[PDB]
C-alpha cells in the first residue's frame, strides 16, 4: 500500500552548472527512502514531493564538452558554455582579476577563452587565475 513520491534531484557542479532530474518513487519504508538520499540536502518537502540538492565533486557533463573559462564584466573570471563572446551567458562568475598583470600569451588565452574538460583542468585554471586577484 505504498506512498507515491515525486522526487526532484538538483545537482550542483564545481563549474556552477546545475542539472535537474525527476523520479517517481513508491515508499514502503520511510527510513529506506531517507537512506537512499542521506547525502542530499532537503530543499522542500510536501505530501507526495521532495526536492533534494547535492554539490557534486565534479564539473557538469555539458561543461565537459562546452566548458570555457573567460573574463567578463570588470575583469571577472567566469565559466561559460561555448567560447565567450561579450553578449554571452556566464554559467557562474567567481572573482575579479587584474588583467594588466597577466603575461601576454596568458592574457590572450584567457581573452579568447580557456577550455576545460575535466575537474583537474577546471581547478588548475581557476587556481592560476586566483593569483591575479586582490587589491592593486
From Swiss-Prot:
GO terms for biological process: sporulation resulting in formation of a cellular spore. It is found in: Forespore intermembrane space. Keywords: Signal, Sporulation. The keyword Signal applies. The keyword Transport does not apply. It comes from the Bacteria. Inhibits the SpoIVB zymogen from undergoing autocatalytic activation by an unknown mechanism, and in this way plays a role in the sigma-K checkpoint of sporulation. Monomer. This is Protein BofC. It comes from Bacillus subtilis (strain 168). The gene is bofC. The chain holds residues 37 to 170 of 170 of the full protein.
Amino acid at each position: 500500500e505504498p506512498l507515491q513520491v515525486h522526487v526532484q534531484l538538483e545537482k550542483v557542479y564545481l563549474d556552477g552548472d546545475v542539472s535537474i532530474e525527476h523520479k517517481h518513487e513508491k515508499v514502503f519504508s520511510m527510513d529506506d527512502f531517507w537512506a537512499a538520499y542521506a547525502g542530499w540536502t532537503l530543499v522542500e518537502q510536501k505530501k507526495g514531493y521532495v526536492l533534494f540538492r547535492k554539490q557534486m565533486d565534479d564539473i557538469s557533463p555539458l561543461s565537459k564538452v562546452n566548458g570555457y573559462i573567460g573574463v567578463s564584466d570588470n575583469g571577472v573570471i567566469s565559466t561559460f558554455h561555448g567560447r565567450p563572446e561579450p553578449a554571452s551567458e556566464p554559467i557562474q562568475s567567481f572573482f575579479q582579476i587584474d588583467l594588466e598583470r597577466l603575461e601576454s600569451h596568458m592574457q590572450k588565452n584567457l581573452l579568447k577563452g580557456i577550455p576545460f574538460r575535466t575537474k583537474a583542468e577546471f581547478e588548475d585554471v581557476i587556481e592560476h587565475m586566483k593569483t591575479y586577484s586582490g587589491l592593486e
